[PDB]
Amino acid sequence: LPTNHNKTKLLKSLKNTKYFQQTTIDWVEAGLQLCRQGHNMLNLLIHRKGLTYLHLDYNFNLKPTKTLTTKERKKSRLGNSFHLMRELLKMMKLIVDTHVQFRLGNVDAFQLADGIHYILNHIGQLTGIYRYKYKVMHQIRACKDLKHIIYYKFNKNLGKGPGCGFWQPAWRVWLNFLRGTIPLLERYIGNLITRQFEGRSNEIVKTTTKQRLDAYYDLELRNSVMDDILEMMPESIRQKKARTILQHLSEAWRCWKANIPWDVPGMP
Amino acid sequence: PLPTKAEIQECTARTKSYIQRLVNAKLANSNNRASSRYVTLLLNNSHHIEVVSKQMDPLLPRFVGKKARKVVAPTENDEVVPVLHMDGSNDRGEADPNEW
Amino acid sequence: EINEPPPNICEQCLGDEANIRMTKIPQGSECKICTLPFTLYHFKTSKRSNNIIKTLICVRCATQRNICQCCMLDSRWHIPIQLRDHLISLVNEENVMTEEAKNDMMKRFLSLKNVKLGGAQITSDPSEADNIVDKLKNILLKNPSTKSFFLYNIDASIPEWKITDTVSQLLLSLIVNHKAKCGGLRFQSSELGERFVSKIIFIIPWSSTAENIKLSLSLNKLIQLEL
Amino acid sequence: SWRDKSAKVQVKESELPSSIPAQTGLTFNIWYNKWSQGFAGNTRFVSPFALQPQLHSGKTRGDNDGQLFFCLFFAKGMCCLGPKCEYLHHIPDEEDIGKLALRTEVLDCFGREKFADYREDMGGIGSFRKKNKTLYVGGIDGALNSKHLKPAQIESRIRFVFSRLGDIDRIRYVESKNCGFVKFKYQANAEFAKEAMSNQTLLLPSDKEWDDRREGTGLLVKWANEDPDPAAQKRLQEELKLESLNMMVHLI
RNA sequence: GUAUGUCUAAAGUUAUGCUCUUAUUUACUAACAA
RNA sequence: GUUCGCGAAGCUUCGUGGACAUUUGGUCAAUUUGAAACAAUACAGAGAUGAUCAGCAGUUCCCCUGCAUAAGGAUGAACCGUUUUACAAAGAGAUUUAU
Numbered sequence: 001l002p003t004n005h006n007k008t009k010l011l012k013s014l015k016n017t018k019y020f021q022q023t024t025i026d027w028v029e030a031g032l033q034l035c036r037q038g039h040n041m042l043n044l045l046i047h048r049k050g051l052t053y054l055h056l057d058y059n060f061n062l063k064p065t066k067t068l069t070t071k072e073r074k075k076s077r078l079g080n081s082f083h084l085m086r087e088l089l090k091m092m093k094l095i096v097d098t099h100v101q102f103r104l105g106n107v108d109a110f111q112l113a114d115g116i117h118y119i120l121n122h123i124g125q126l127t128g129i130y131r132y133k134y135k136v137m138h139q140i141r142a143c144k145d146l147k148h149i150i151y152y153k154f155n156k157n158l159g160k161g162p163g164c165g166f167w168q169p170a171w172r173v174w175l176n177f178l179r180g181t182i183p184l185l186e187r188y189i190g191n192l193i194t195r196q197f198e199g200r201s202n203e204i205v206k207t208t209t210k211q212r213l214d215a216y217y218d219l220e221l222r223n224s225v226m227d228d229i230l231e232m233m234p235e236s237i238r239q240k241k242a243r244t245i246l247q248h249l250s251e252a253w254r255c256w257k258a259n260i261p262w263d264v265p266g267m268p
Numbered sequence: 269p270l271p272t273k274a275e276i277q278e279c280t281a282r283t284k285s286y287i288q289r290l291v292n293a294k295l296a297n298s299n300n301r302a303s304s305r306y307v308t309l310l311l312n313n314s315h316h317i318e319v320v321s322k323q324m325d326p327l328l329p330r331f332v333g334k335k336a337r338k339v340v341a342p343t344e345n346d347e348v349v350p351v352l353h354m355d356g357s358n359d360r361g362e363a364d365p366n367e368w
Numbered sequence: 369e370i371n372e373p374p375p376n377i378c379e380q381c382l383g384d385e386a387n388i389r390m391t392k393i394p395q396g397s398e399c400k401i402c403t404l405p406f407t408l409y410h411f412k413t414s415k416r417s418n419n420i421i422k423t424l425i426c427v428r429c430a431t432q433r434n435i436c437q438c439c440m441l442d443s444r445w446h447i448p449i450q451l452r453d454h455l456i457s458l459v460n461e462e463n464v465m466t467e468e469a470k471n472d473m474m475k476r477f478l479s480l481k482n483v484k485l486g487g488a489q490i491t492s493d494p495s496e497a498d499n500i501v502d503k504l505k506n507i508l509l510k511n512p513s514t515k516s517f518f519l520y521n522i523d524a525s526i527p528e529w530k531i532t533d534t535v536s537q538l539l540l541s542l543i544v545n546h547k548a549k550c551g552g553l554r555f556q557s558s559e560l561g562e563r564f565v566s567k568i569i570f571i572i573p574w575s576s577t578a579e580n581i582k583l584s585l586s587l588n589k590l591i592q593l594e595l
Numbered sequence: 596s597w598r599d600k601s602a603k604v605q606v607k608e609s610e611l612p613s614s615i616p617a618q619t620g621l622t623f624n625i626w627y628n629k630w631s632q633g634f635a636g637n638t639r640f641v642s643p644f645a646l647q648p649q650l651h652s653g654k655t656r657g658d659n660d661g662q663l664f665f666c667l668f669f670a671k672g673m674c675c676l677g678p679k680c681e682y683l684h685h686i687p688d689e690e691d692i693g694k695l696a697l698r699t700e701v702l703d704c705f706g707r708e709k710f711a712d713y714r715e716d717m718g719g720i721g722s723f724r725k726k727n728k729t730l731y732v733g734g735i736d737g738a739l740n741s742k743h744l745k746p747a748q749i750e751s752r753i754r755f756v757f758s759r760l761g762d763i764d765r766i767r768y769v770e771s772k773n774c775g776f777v778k779f780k781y782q783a784n785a786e787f788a789k790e791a792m793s794n795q796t797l798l799l800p801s802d803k804e805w806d807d808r809r810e811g812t813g814l815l816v817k818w819a820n821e822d823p824d825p826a827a828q829k830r831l832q833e834e835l836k837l838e839s840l841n842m843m844v845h846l847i
Numbered sequence: 848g849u850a851u852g853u854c855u856a857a858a859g860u861u862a863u864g865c866u867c868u869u870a871u872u873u874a875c876u877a878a879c880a881a
Numbered sequence: 882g883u884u885c886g887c888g889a890a891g892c893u894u895c896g897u898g899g900a901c902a903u904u905u906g907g908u909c910a911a912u913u914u915g916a917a918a919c920a921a922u923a924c925a926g927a928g929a930u931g932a933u934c935a936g937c938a939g940u941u942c943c944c945c946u947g948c949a950u951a952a953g954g955a956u957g958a959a960c961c962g963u964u965u966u967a968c969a970a971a972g973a974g975a976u977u978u979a980u
């Protein structure tokens with residue numbers, strides 16, 4: 001159920017400000033301009049990070065220029081935000097490019113339609129979107145299913161071959177995927193560019209997880225024990241005298257583990 | 269006296285107002301425009317002036333200043349405060365350490 | 369945090385208008401002292417005045433120094449902070465400095481402290497300021513056409529600007545070395561030189577107890593030459 | 596005079612140089628405008644242009660307005676907006692210094708904010724915390740393409756250069772340190788020169804290395820720490836006292 | 848062989864019982880050869 | 882400039898009183914001197930302990946990559962250095978001083 005209170009859209013919000021103007025531009029123009037824009041954005045981000053050795057190709061296919069020093073390599077492992085952004089632009093760059101080709105006098109409209117259809121049904125095979133965000137397999141699978149459905153309603157009496165267009169339902173799928181992800185990428189890339197600008201938060205504090213549960217447990221335990229002993233101890237002894245205590249405890253634990261009775265004489 | 273109901277209403281009003289404002293501040297601060305919808309003039313002498321907040325481009329960072337600085341806090345314990353325990357144990361207090 | 373402290377801007381700075389319209393960008397810059405976010409305020413002094421005035425430092429910093437947030441001058445006397453600290457050091461005391469820590473972490477820390485600096489303690493309370501002022505007050509009470517001269521007996525403290533301006537008043541180029549005092553003055557024309565000479569610590573030959581003076585000149589000159 | 600004529604263009608934007616200096620490294624960095632993948636060799640070079648003030652200085656859009664700041668690119672001698680520039684185009688004087696004297700405490704004559712501390716070099720625009728008027732003038736060896744001139748010759752040429760741009764409090768060349776200390780009448784003036792002769796040449800048309808002026812490394816005009824010399828320290832102190840007397844009498 | 852970590856990358860801040868000679872072991876180390 | 886009233890020449894033209902409309906942007910400014918980061922050359926090449934190994938922590942006015950409160954950066958790095966007093970009471974011997 002869509003929540004109703006949030007009736008300040010993104011575009012509306014942007015419209016409200018001065019820094020945007022509006023124009024009537026051809027969709028191809030919009031596309032090409034957005035490839036150019038996107039390219040500039042991603043390059044700006046990468047260079048900002050410092051790693052100029054990652055050359056963006058104009059086809060949004062990122063690759064390193066030089067052989068990478070291990071440090072450099074570590075630096076350049078861009079995350080699932082940036083790569084996902086790239087992949088979406090790759091997707092877009094494909095279809096927009098196909099339109100350009102069509103309109104640039106290369107290919108016929110049927111050829112265009114087929115091209116677009118091919119792109120949508122082979123987003124997996126044309127842009128490793130799945131790599132970064134694997135739930136896109138669902139989308140890919142859906143597209144495949146559509147193709148299977150469509151073709152066999154498109155090729156009843158007609159034989160086999162590649163020349164079917166009809167890109168609608170797949171296109172719908174991709175739109176809904178983008179709808180799904182727009183929030184995710186606003187968060188992800190939001191945080192990313194924030195990190196680029198503001199440093200990362202220095203109140204890191206890690207949660208417990210399966211991997212560090214035991215260590216945390218044990219530290220909590222020894223803190224508790226230490227506290228109790230200090231409460232007990234009437235002299236108000238130093239932290240260095242607590243080291244003896246906790247070390248004693250540790251030994252005791254080990255003794256228990258062994259099943260050797262832990263009977264140190266000098267204790268209270 | 270257990271506090272007055274009327275005065276509890278006061279305190280609640282004050283502190284509730286405060287915390288609501290604080291949370292609003294926290295929210296409109298954050299980059300997630302999603303959380304903008306849960307948000308519940310001056311003079312610099314005898315001389316007078318109008319304060320304004322110019323709306324900025326929603327591309328450029330909202331808060332250019334903040335950059336996650338490490339900052340050490342000065343304590344500011346300007347007023348001294350005692351630590352004040354009343355006891356004097358000699359017999360049990362000296363016999364015990366030999367055991368402890 | 370909440371916008372609890374108001375901005376600390378002085379009068380002269382701000383300009384003589386009954387109502388200006390300034391803007392506040394909150395969390396709007398790191399300050400010029402303590403590298404620390406603060407609410408940046410800014411305004412054109414007039415509507416059609418081109419120069420914006422932006423609040424350079426943070427309010428805590430301002431309070432700490434007890435200054436304007438745009439001028440970096442004391443809010444009372446409208447004078448450089450260092451200068452005012454010197455003045456304060458001079459009257460009533462021997463030593464009053466306001467040491468800013470030049471290390472990026474420590475400066476932040478210092479800024480955070482709600483404690484006035486040396487001179488700021490005086491200038492905050494107006495009574496004390498007044499007292500300081502009154503104490504200060506108490507404390508108070510032959511022309512061959514050479515176009516090229518070689519001037520001597522130059523007070524060590526005097527600057528070239530004073531010299532040239534004096535010459536202008538008595539009316540170009542000039543060379544002075546405060547080591548030698550071989551003030552190698554040169555005029556833009558010989559006629560001008562004539563004019564100057566005809567118009568006449570002004571010991572002045574026209575090369576191209578005066579004895580002792582010559583000696584003092586001599587030794588100093590020699591020393592200069594060795595340098 | 597400057598006020599008699601409108602300011603000529605330093606150089607047309609065709610003649611202006613691009614923002615892609617020297618390929619110092621293997622690849623260009625878009626968000627920084629610097630180079631990268633290699634910092635082999637020094638970056639600095641000699642300014643192609645110079646403020647020839649009488650041939651250039653004049654009226655502007657600013658001289659109409661009462662813009663209180665001078666054109667950095669005028670000082671550098673490369674302003675591509677001549678009379679159409681908002682920032683002014685002439686040597687700072689008592690009238691203009693006096694005019695902006697309020698604001699110039701906090702920031703430069705080039706209308707850019709001063710900082711808490713000098714940039715470790717004493718190299719960049721001055722700190723607000725000091726009211727310095729004294730420019731250190733390093734790199735004279737580099738500024739003359741290793742021309743074995745006389746100290747007298749050096750100091751004279753230096754004088755010729757900085758006296759042209761602002762009223763001098765004093766200058767003194769140091770043979771033992773191969774540098775200048777060029778105290779100015781005003782802080783605005785100091786600021787102006789400090790940019791106006793940054794990365795410039797001390798060479799002249801009469802000198803034989805005139806066509807090699809570009810190829811060296813320019814004047815390193817930075818700001819000066821006050822001398823350890825107590826001979827001048829005392830003078831400085833006296834000056835401070837005098838100034839203090841002025842302001843203090845002015846308070847009442 | 849690496850992570851990783853240091854290093855360099857140029858312009859001058861104004862003060863006056865032993866020494867010896869050898870041969871042998873053992874250990875460790877060695878992106879050096881077998 | 883439009884228009885609505887008027888006057889002076891021929892519904893047309895020149896002059897007059899109105900109404901309409903009446904404050905843009907800048908925290909910035911074009912290359913060295915107000916700030917990145919690796920990179921290259923050189924040098925070493927990795928915590929326990931004898932040797933070889935998985936790590937998870939912790940403190941840190943160290944951070945980086947990461948969407949991250951996953952995780953990973955060599956167990957990410959540094960932590961291994963330095964280290965004197967709440968200083969007492971009792972006895973014995975020797976020296977001095979005084980009564």
Ligand SMILES: O=P(O)(O)O[C@H]1[C@H](OP(=O)(O)O)[C@@H](OP(=O)(O)O)[C@H](OP(=O)(O)O)[C@@H](OP(=O)(O)O)[C@H]1OP(=O)(O)O
Nearest residue numbers: 118121122125144147148151152155159160161162163164
């Ligand atoms: O089933 P998929 O693995 O998605 O592969 C299909 C399938 O090929 P296979 O049957 O060999 O797997 C289609 O063949 P048909 O079942 O329709 O005979 C074919 O469709 P066309 O016959 O219409 O070409 C289509 O190929 P295309 O993508 O060129 O339409 C192709 O997809 P892939 O080429 O991606 O394997």
Ligand SMILES: [K+]
Nearest residue numbers: 953954956957
């Ligand atoms: K870890």
Ligand SMILES: [K+]
Nearest residue numbers: 938939956957
């Ligand atoms: K660790």
Ligand SMILES: [Mg+2]
Nearest residue numbers: 953954955956
């Ligand atoms: Mg590891």
Ligand SMILES: [Mg+2]
Nearest residue numbers: 935936955956
């Ligand atoms: Mg390991």
Ligand SMILES: [Zn+2]
Nearest residue numbers: 378381436439
């Ligand atoms: Zn002010």
Ligand SMILES: [Zn+2]
Nearest residue numbers: 399402426429
């Ligand atoms: Zn501050």
Ligand SMILES: [Zn+2]
Nearest residue numbers: 666674676680
């Ligand atoms: Zn200009």
